[PDB]
Design a protein around this ligand. Structure first.
Ligand SMILES: O=P(O)(O)OC[C@H]1O[C@@](CO)(OP(=O)(O)O)[C@@H](O)[C@@H]1O
Ligand SMILES: O=P(O)(O)OC[C@H]1O[C@@](CO)(OP(=O)(O)O)[C@@H](O)[C@@H]1O
Ligand SMILES: O=C([O-])C(=O)[O-]
Ligand SMILES: O=C([O-])C(=O)[O-]
Ligand SMILES: [K+]
Ligand SMILES: [K+]
Ligand SMILES: [Mg+2]
Ligand SMILES: [Mg+2]
Lengths: 498, 498, 498, 498
């Protein structure tokens, strides 16, 4: 039982030597140089997130180039994630750049572009043109991560709402706007998003984090936008509002993976419900073997301080115990003072949580929920993990070209590394959002066809030696096809490292 | 499985009506007035904590008096808790009142009290005579709540260690010292704590939060100092370092309760290891059925902000899911801008975690670790909770004078309120640290001795109707003695509300 | 697991001191005298079965009188069961009293009464007048517990079938006939059965074993036949053919209990399927808390030998492990040479099997299958058994007038005796088919009303002492109503024997 | 739960097509002819047992020869088993060849061989010199297979016990003696058994059924007597007394297999305790994955009758449910009237119990008791069975030369056939005592050495199609080595049938 497990825990035991969970870092001014990226990577960044809410194509092009250069210098496969603006709503500017509000303060908000740059305590601009359809008298506008709320007193005209300010707040430029439970219908893929996606395909990004996905239909819109050259890019749907949570099953089925985007989520639904949605979403993803990323304010204080709070440490540990493949940093690495240290903390916490995890509870729970009969490869991969447990394998080794077989082994949550020898660099980069997987590239053009898998296997075992996963005499659980079968693995071997 | 339970959660269903977990709030300049305390109570404070690290008896006398006036106004039983200064190691003073250190600086630290008042960059004093036995070369000394860290390079004589400064810091006079992983030997009760404990006894406080408990002997020393007149006051041992964690079993056995005091604990042991300690301590308390409080930085940012971070919301929920009876607020209510809002959030988060808890999993896990045969009162109590699940009881009712039986029922973690009818105001106040319990006071001097239980039972059932726990024709599970047995409950009845 | 349980078993441990399972003995020429009945009772007979397939009312009247006289002499409540002939089919007589058959031997069978007494190798009588409707050319008649089969070659006339004999057999007088998978529609209650039942009610029999029940409708026919004076008599339906097994759920719902009548069953369906039907039927009865009796050829060889076979011993043990309340003897005690010894064996085997049973596996399995919410009394009774386990109670004590509450405690299969104090002698006799129950009679006319239950409780505890179930200082789990509630028990006490 | 599994059984569904359990038949005058043996084999005999308690080498040579001729005619691999006379204690002779005892008679029994030939009512001889140490006053001596029992009253000298006859019996010359509960010390291999064992080795028998194994030392003595030339013959230790049961762990560890020999065992220990021994022994064998045979009186009555009793049908089914690989027939096929019918019933009952077995419960229970880490071959084998359940494989296929791997797979109790392709006729014959296994012989001398497994694999898959286990496009789970590993299987494949 969880209880009996807990009472046996020790703060005195050694921790896991190889970190299973993966860390996503948002790049910004703190972290864009090749050098800063090298150090993020050294600290434990597996994926680099470009936030296309801000910056031009040139700015992100510099991110892309710098990532590839850092990674090549270090010998790493680092994923690059394009995170879409999507249907964001913001304020315009204000005279000076701040204004200040008190409760009962009556403020007019307008969609008139003419007030964009020149906003005040009585009148300012919001860039959602359908504002006065979206929210009626009595409804509520949430401003700046929902810190200040505005009650709508009346519709003045089609362009203008008169609003009752409900509390004190310090209003900076171009702040976020949220409209919980309103008829907001903006596209999942705007004109702006469409260009950003096209740029992603051109630049060969590995995955999209698609903001504000509320339907499987919207996931497909993002797929269609990425066009023909873009079909192998992962779509991770960001769950961020009421509808996203409601439609989660079918959003999951359409997507390659999911981010719990707790930032917008905890404004869009009451903040205290985010914990329930997180547990629910992470688990649903585990059950179908699709990567899931927990995001936002995980080590937030560390944007300014050299140490995290107690809450932040448990938040990271619990995202891991919840079953998340990945944990994410946003402001902390994009614009914080301690990018490297925050990533290092997150890593150390990950490894604690991983060492606190009961070995086989996930394996069993997940297995018990799968429809029988399985397809052969899933039977191979689950039984492979089972026999890793039974022999205390220090590693597994799987040949995967698309990444499918590596994600399938990971679905069953072994307690050791999954070394994946792949024939595609993009698979190396994409498997970064999958717990436990460590990727090695086999260049089949340079080295030959490897029909019998002996070149790729040897390369995986040599990697196991060099990275100190296992030594001579240790058992490794090796998964690929036999000599005939094409398209999936049908075979498991147990192998002593030579 | 946890996993299956997760996938079946819904964020949309109504949540529990009756909050099970309890909330300790620290009093300070934000919250001390009778007014402020009324609102704290309306907001969900069950226990008021006095931090005797700071302030005179005069100050805390106001807190005591004001709490009692606030509660009497509202008709509530509110626990009062004295949280001791506790032992501490501190540096000496510095020339000119301050000194600045830089990475690489070599500093001697001495227990020669000749140096007490003349600290320099070269050399300063620490007031723990045993220093050079307790920390060996290669060990760390943390200074100023962990902010500066020294590595011990070597021992120069039996009173002097040569050290290496690890980071930039400015020290002033008499900063805190921590000796992570070190067997420290200080009195459990200092001269100051005696006076504080004598005061608490005289003013009739309900519980001690005893700082930095290292051993069971220390709990017994704190009991000894409370004397005959204080023999009924709960000792809640604060676990704040590795020794506390090492000795948890015997400490639990000696105490009435435990606080996982994460502030100091996150300084004394690596921060990532606090989550493992927390899980283990809470579970170990659950197993023996003693209240445990999770503490510190649970909602830190709300000291300044009117909404909590995502990490924070999850910290509170997980403490509840871990199995804590209580969660606690320090800074957030002592000195913060939003004392009420922060308690209200904590209440709402508690309820969400509660509502997301699988009913019976804790009950079974806890019951399966009990040694057979049980005492009869504990069979009666666990079977009472069993029967409450079997009939979906909306409430249970117990008669307890010391509060033992109420704690024994709570131990088995029913999903409904446990109404306790008691003959001691102090029991009402003390039962505030126990999950699910709601106390009603029966005045025996004023209503007769109730040998046959009938009046106390009616009082409880009336209370069930008033407080809207249950109504006419609902089954309530009622626990007390039969007509002849004294000293413990040997009887469970199921009763329909008339 | 069953496996892990088994490997821990010992042939060297002491056995249970109090036998939970109950033994039904068929009375005949070996066993009808008062003296032989005294000895059967001493050996461990709990219920006496009158087989109304044979004997007149006078003969059974002698059984009834002799049972009551034996039991009164010994101070016992012994149940009396009337087992109906029902829709039996038999042969008539033969010249001399045997004839002999060989394979290919062509035999005419007739329903013509005129051939009743005078049958031969070529022509004989079967007492089912619709024979030549029931079975067509190609069908099969099973003769003498299905030892010889006859293939029907043709219908000669409406009275006569020409048959192909399929094997060698030695044919004695008035042998049994079975017609698997034929359109046999005889009444569950014939004219003969109706008189036998009426006689049962007049004579105050405790239960009916109703032969060949194939529908819930038929159970109700037996209920209607017992008329108004007969409504409190248990109907145990004998499952004995295809249709009985098919309709088992609804037969169970209509009945008070079930016998697996393996004799006719294993002719009516292939013999090897009886093991599957037994497991299935016993378990279904366990799940609704209705008594079930395993019957027939359990110690068959002991009809002639002083020791049973190895198969017979395991058959009895496994009926007990299967969950049967009772095991039955037929020929073995009715006409065998070793009535006393066979009953003694059966008892010793019962106690072995009982001691081999895992304590709580039945409790849990049964509890997990019950619809929530339970009614209050079932919550009381299941939790009562749970707390017996938790305190290792050596006994339970329940007040039951109808027997309902005693059968409800038994449903949850405690590992100790259930002492039942009842106000009806008929409840004492009827509870003999319920595992674990030991009955004490409280005469409320002689001793007064006992509203507070103190007279009945005292009588139960005194019985516990005298029968050596528990001594002074031992805990007993006592179940009845509190001082107000009428009609079911709402209360559980744990009591130390004074 | 077993209980839930039961209630869901249906007597009407089709049963398993492929019988998993195996049937040992004893040869005798009923069954010795080549004709009789062909029919036995067609009826379901896998192993022919020779009881060397009776008959010359000449006789058993006919059995051996005839079995081999019968099998060669039918194309079957049939095991031949030599079941030893084993140790025995017997009385001396009596004056006039016989003597009659009555309850209450006092008889001296002496180990003074002066009395060997002059037994009277007053005094007779028992040929066990250690008698007066092995049984103390108050202990029993069983005479004539338990039929007569004596209580030891006292020890008269160091060679004489005064005894009390308990029941009527007639003794003749040299009756059996059993000393229930007594530490008896006889050679494991008598002078007669040597000759018998030498014979068996020379005639190439597949297995010894070694009578009355008390200790592991005895198994080793039997191995020693088999010598170098017999090192490959299975030793199946017969557990026939309390010592066998006491020492089961070490006996199991020394043996290749176990027979629960219930005949003698039911004489040596109370008969009701045989069921406990049986359950424990079968389970303990299952846990280490060695074949166990349940024996004796399983279908006793069918020695004389053409149908079995209800007890008997249940005995066989329960032995299968207990987890026995094999069940056995002695008298029933050696000397009975219905040797074929009895085997056919046993086959049909086996199949019904099999069909009623919960698929995976044995697999999980067995796997959960294995020590971690496993050997790799055992991980491969248990995970292979896992994967067979996951894909509902209709068969598994293993290459095994010694039969180790076939036993290792069977250990995990898959629900389908285990096809074993082996290079040793003797392995085929020996695998007959192992649940589920069906052997096919690959002739390496005649078809080449098959380093790459491809021919043996094809042979097995062809065999799967012919024997109708599976057809085109069904998944079969295939276990052997990869191309380099020798001595054990390290590889599992899932393969569709071409
Ligand atoms: O104060 P605790 O130790 O909880 O004991 C209370 C129990 O003991 C009893 C019996 O002594 O108290 P009471 O005498 O006040 O009625 C039970 O009724 C009651 O449930
Ligand atoms: O005879 P056992 O001990 O079962 O070993 C058989 C196993 O060893 C191997 C490998 O040595 O035999 P083989 O060399 O005959 O091919 C595996 O292929 C086979 O499964
Ligand atoms: O967009 C995000 O990542 C969020 O809102 O957390
Ligand atoms: O009638 C019976 O009892 C039987 O057939 O077993
Ligand atoms: K303090
Ligand atoms: K023998
Ligand atoms: Mg502290
Ligand atoms: Mg024997």
């Amino acid at each position: 039982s969880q209880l009996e497990h807990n009472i046996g825990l020790s703060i005195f035991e050694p921790v896991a030597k190889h970190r299973a969970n993966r860390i996503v870092c948002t790049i910004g001014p703190s972290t864009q140089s090749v050098e800063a990226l090298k150090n993020l990577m050294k600290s434990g960044m597996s994926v680099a997130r470009m936030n296309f809410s801000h910056g031009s194509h040139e700015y992100h092009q510099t991110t892309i180039n710098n990532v590839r250069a850092a990674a090549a210098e270090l010998g790493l496969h680092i994923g690059i994630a394009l995170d879409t603006k999507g249907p964001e709503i913001r304020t315009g500017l204000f005279k000076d750049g701040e204004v200040s509000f008190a409760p009962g303060d009556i403020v007019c908000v307008t969609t008139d572009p003419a007030y964009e740059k020149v906003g005040t305590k009585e009148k300012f601009y919001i860039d959602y043109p359908q504002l006065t359809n979206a929210v009626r008298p009595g409804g509520s506008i949430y401003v700046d991560d929902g810190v200040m709320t505005l009650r709508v007193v009346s519709k003045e005209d089609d362009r203008t709402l008169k609003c009752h300010v409900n509390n004190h707040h310090r209003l900076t430029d171009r702040r976020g706007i949220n409209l919980p439970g309103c008829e907001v219908d903006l596209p999942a893929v705007s004109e702006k998003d469409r260009k950003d996606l096209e740029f992603g395909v051109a630049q060969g990004v590995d995955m999209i984090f698609a903001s504000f996905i509320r339907t499987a239909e919207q996931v497909r819109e993002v797929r269609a936008a990425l066009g023909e050259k873009g079909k192998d890019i992962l779509i991770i749907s960001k769950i961020e509002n009421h509808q996203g949570v409601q439609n989660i099953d079918s959003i999951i089925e359409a997507s390659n993976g999911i981010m719990v985007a707790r930032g917008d989520l905890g404004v869009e639904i009451p903040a205290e419900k985010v914990c329930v949605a997180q547990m629910c979403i992470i688990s649903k993803c585990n059950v179908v073997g699709k990567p899931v990323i927990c995001a936002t304010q995980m080590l937030e204080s560390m944007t300014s301080n050299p140490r995290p709070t107690r809450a932040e440490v448990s938040d990271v540990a619990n995202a891991v115990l919840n079953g998340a493949d990945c944990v994410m940093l946003s402001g902390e690495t994009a614009k914080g003072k301690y990018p490297n240290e925050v990533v290092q903390y997150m890593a150390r916490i990950c490894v604690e949580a991983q060492s606190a995890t009961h070995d086989t509870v996930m394996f069993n729970s997940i297995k018990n929920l799968q429809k029988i009969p399985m397809c052969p490869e899933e039977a191979v991969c689950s039984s492979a993990v089972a026999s890793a447990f039974e022999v205390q394998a220090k590693a597994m080794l799987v040949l995967s070209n698309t990444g499918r077989s590596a994600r399938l082994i990971s679905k069953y949550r072994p307690n050791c590394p999954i070394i994946c020898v792949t024939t595609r660099l993009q698979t190396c980069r994409q498997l970064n959002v999958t717990r436990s997987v460590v990727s090695v590239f086999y260049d089949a053009a340079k080295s030959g066809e490897d029909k019998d898998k002996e070149k790729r296997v040897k390369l995986g075992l040599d990697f196991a030696k060099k990275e100190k996963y296992a030594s001579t005499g240790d058992v490794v659980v090796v998964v690929h096809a036999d000599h005939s079968v094409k398209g999936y693995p049908n075979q498991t071997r147990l192998i002593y490292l030579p």
